[PDB]
Structure formats: structure tokens, C-alpha cells
């Protein structure tokens, strides 16, 4: 039928001026272009077919050829930036935007998908899709009282494409585009389909991956409670973007971080900081590090939620990149914490795993640990208890490691190490 045509035959059919011959040739192109094993994208491009496909998107009396070319162009646009650029170069962006209004749901959906691929290429094509006015028709497809009346795959496609309009930096998406999209995004973030939740949550993570003003737009929409709820989900595909979004938000101001805490996020961290997925633990610990960089009352809520033992645990045993985030969380904690909070940290057992990580070859983690120890000694000074900490560090082999760090190549490490020797082990 239309199975395994040559590109040359596809060209012959598409260059006939017979719409039905063109349809069958376009379907044959679609079938080539949708095979998983090496779809001949560049051959189709090189045969000059993209402009014909784009012209077929406008064949209103001819919805099957609209669909077939939309699918063909979608998969071409799914490839490299050069392959996506060829689709854009053929005029596909306004054609696909016009196709969003198709009364045929499967065609509308295919145009949604193709625009998602185009926008997914990068900020430039994302902004170009926005400039051609994709957002209004995309959002109009979701302007129903209850998202649950929409077809499942259709809604997931719309969510995914919207998330690509929220994606990428240098530049971030246009502020008015974000403002226009956000209420619908918030709708999707409360939907019951796990894939819609995951992609909405990714979209929110992109929007919060930026300056405090970007974070504020999201936080002001009141999504933090829902993010915290998703943070506790059982599905890893939902926890991951929820944790990234929460982690992004706490890189913001202390007040933005406070929303995260007020929404109850800290109660999820016993599980997050022991999560068997390495990247969850790492990003939970990174998130903790930006919370312990907060105000003393925020450190206190970390304490109250029982999270210092969990930091001790991650410091004691975790993927090394997670232990690095934990070292940072401790240094931030000891930099901003009260004497009592820092004392509490020692009582939880921080010293020995902190010492054990001074054997790491990573130069940066050593400075982080040395600085935390400095901060802990300064707290010990204020209680006249310096020497007890010196014994503690002595008894677990920490002083041996600090001594040996005088012999470290890095200047700031050898310095900070020799200082620690000069003030507390003399």
C-alpha cells in the first residue's frame, strides 16, 4: 500500500498534481518517518519535501493529508536542531498554529505536538513559536470547565508542549508569555493524570529556574502547597520535577523559602534524604543546603523537623555528589546558625562523618568541610569548650587529616588547615 516506498516514489507522488496521489505519497513518507530504526529524516529533507508537507497543512478540504504531513513534519522536527530548523524554514510554524483550530482533534493534537518539538529545540525557536501567536490557540484548547472531559493523550500532549514553551534559558521565556500560561499551568498542576502532573511540574521547575522575580511569579500563583503535595507522591516521575521546583524556589529569597517550609515541605525530607534514587537524594540535599543557608528561624525548623540526623546520615553514607551537597548544607548551617543550633549539630554526630570526608580528593569539598569546622570551633569558643571539640576531632582521626591537609596543593586549603592547627591543637 503505502508501506516501504522509496523516497524517489514519494517525491513522484507528491510532485504529481493529484491530491489523492499526494495523500498516498505523504502517508508513505509518514510511514518511513515513523519507523523507530533510523527514520530517513535527512533523505526526506534533501528530497525537498518539507515545503510540500507544509503546504499540505493548509489543505482544509483534505484533513487526511493535513494529518499525514503534520505527522511527517512532527518527526522531522523531532530530530536535530538542523532538522527542526528545516521544518521551521519551510514555514511550518504559522501553518501548525493555524492547524490548532482544526475541528479534527487528532489533527489539532498533531499540530500541538509539532509545535512542542519546534519550541523544544531551544529558546530561539520557542520564542519564535510564541511570536507567531501559538499561546492563545494552545490555551484555548484547554479553556474547558473540567480538564477531565478532554482526551487523555490530547491533554498530555498539550501539557507537554506548554511545558516546552516554559523551558530553556538565555533567555528565559518572555515574561508576558509566562504570565499568560501560568493559570492554565496551575490548572494542569492540579489534574489527576500522572503524566500531566509530571509535565506541569517540569514546566513549573523551568519557570522557577531563574531570578527571584521569576520565582515570585510562580510562588504568587499559590502553587507551593500543590508542589509539596506532589513532592510526597509515590511516582518518581512526579517527585522528581516537584523536588526540582521546590529546590529552585528555595534558591530565592528567605520569604520564598518560608512558603516552602510553611507548606509543609520539610516533613517530606526524611523520605527524600533517604530516597533510593541517587538524584532525588542529591537534589533533596541540595535543597536542604539552600534552606540551611536561610534565617536562624528556618534552620530551627530544619532542626525541629528532625532533619539534622538525616544530614548526618547523608554525610555518613551517600553518593559522593550527595555528600558534597551535605557538606554544603552543614557549612551553610554552621555559617548562619546560633551557637545552640551548632551545638545541636555536634550532638547529632556531625563531626566524625565530616572528618571522614576530609580524605576526599575533591578540593572544593575540603574547603567546605574546613570552613564548617572553623564555624563549629567559633561556636565552641563562645562556650569555652574549644578543646573538647579538639579531642572529638582527635579521637576520630580528624586531626590527622587536618595535619595532612597542610601538605595539600591548594593554597586556601593548606592555609585554612594550618590555621585550624594553630588555634586549637597547640
Amino acid at each position: 500500500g503505502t508501506v516501504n516506498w522509496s523516497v524517489e516514489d514519494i517525491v513522484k507522488g507528491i510532485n504529481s498534481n493529484n491530491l489523492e496521489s499526494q495523500l498516498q505519497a505523504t502517508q508513505a513518507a509518514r510511514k518511513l518517518l515513523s519507523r523507530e530504526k533510523q527514520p530517513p529524516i535527512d533523505n526526506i529533507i534533501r528530497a525537498g519535501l518539507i515545503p510540500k508537507f507544509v503546504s499540505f497543512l493548509g489543505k482544509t478540504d483534505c484533513s487526511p493529508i493535513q494529518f499525514e504531513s503534520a505527522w511527517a513534519l512532527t518527526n522531522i522536527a523531532s530530530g536535530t536542531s538542523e532538522q527542526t530548523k528545516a521544518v521551521v524554514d519551510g514555514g511550518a510554524i504559522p501553518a501548525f498554529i493555524s492547524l490548532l483550530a482544526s475541528p479534527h482533534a487528532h489533527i489539532s493534537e498533531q499540530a500541538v505536538w509539532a509545535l512542542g518539538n519546534i519550541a523544544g529545540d531551544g529558546s530561539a525557536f520557542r520564542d519564535l513559536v510564541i511570536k507567531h501567536g501559538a499561546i492563545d490557540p494552545l490555551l484555548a484548547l484547554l479553556a474547558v470547565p473540567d480538564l477531565s472531559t478532554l482526551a487523555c493523550g490530547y491533554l498530555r500532549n498539550l501539557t507537554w508542549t506548554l511545558s516546552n514553551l516554559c523551558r530553556n534559558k538565555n533567555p528565559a521565556p518572555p515574561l508576558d508569555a509566562v504570565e499568560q500560561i501560568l493559570p492554565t499551568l496551575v490548572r494542569l498542576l492540579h489534574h489527576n493524570d500522572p503524566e500531566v502532573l509530571a509535565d506541569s511540574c517540569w514546566a513549573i521547575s523551568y519557570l522557577t529556574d531563574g531570578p527571584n522575580e521569576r520565582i515570585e511569579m510562580v510562588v504568587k500563583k499559590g502553587v507551593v502547597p500543590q508542589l509539596v503535595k506532589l513532592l510526597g507522591a509515590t511516582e518518581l516521575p512526579i517527585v522528581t520535577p516537584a523536588l526540582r521546583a521546590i529546590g529552585n524556589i528555595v534558591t530565592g529569597t528567605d520569604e520564598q523559602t518560608q512558603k516552602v517550609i510553611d507548606a509543609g515541605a520539610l516533613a517530606v525530607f526524611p523520605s527524600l534524604l533517604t530516597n533510593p534514587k541517587t538524584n532525588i537524594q542529591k537534589e533533596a540535599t541540595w535543597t536542604m543546603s539552600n534552606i540551611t543557608a536561610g534565617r536562624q528561624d528556618q534552620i530551627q525548623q530544619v532542626v525541629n523537623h528532625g532533619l539534622v540526623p538525616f544530614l548526618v546520615g547523608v554525610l555518613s553514607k551517600a553518593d559522593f555528589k550527595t555528600q558534597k551537597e551535605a557538606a554544603w548544607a552543614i557549612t551553610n548551617y554552621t555559617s548562619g546558625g546560633t551557637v545552640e543550633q551548632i551545638v545541636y549539630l555536634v550532638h547529632c554526630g556531625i563531626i566524625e562523618p565530616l572528618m571522614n570526608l576530609l580524605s576526599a580528593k575533591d578540593t572544593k569539598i575540603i574547603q567546605v568541610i574546613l570552613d564548617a569546622i572553623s564555624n563549629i570551633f567559633q561556636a565552641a569558643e563562645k562556650l569555652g569548650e574549644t578543646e573538647k571539640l579538639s579531642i572529638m576531632i582527635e579521637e576520630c582521626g580528624g586531626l590527622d587529616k587536618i595535619e595532612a591537609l597542610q601538605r595539600h596543593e591548594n593554597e586556601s586549603v593548606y592555609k585554612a588547615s594550618l590555621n585550624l592547627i594553630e588555634k586549637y591543637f597547640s
Partner: peptide, 11 residues
Amino acid sequence: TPNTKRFKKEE
């Protein structure tokens, strides 16, 4: 994570 671009295999 997730996919910047999606290839349509079927349906």
C-alpha cells in the same frame, strides 16, 4: 529529563 522532542511512532 524530560524529552525536549518527541518522535511519533504510531497511532
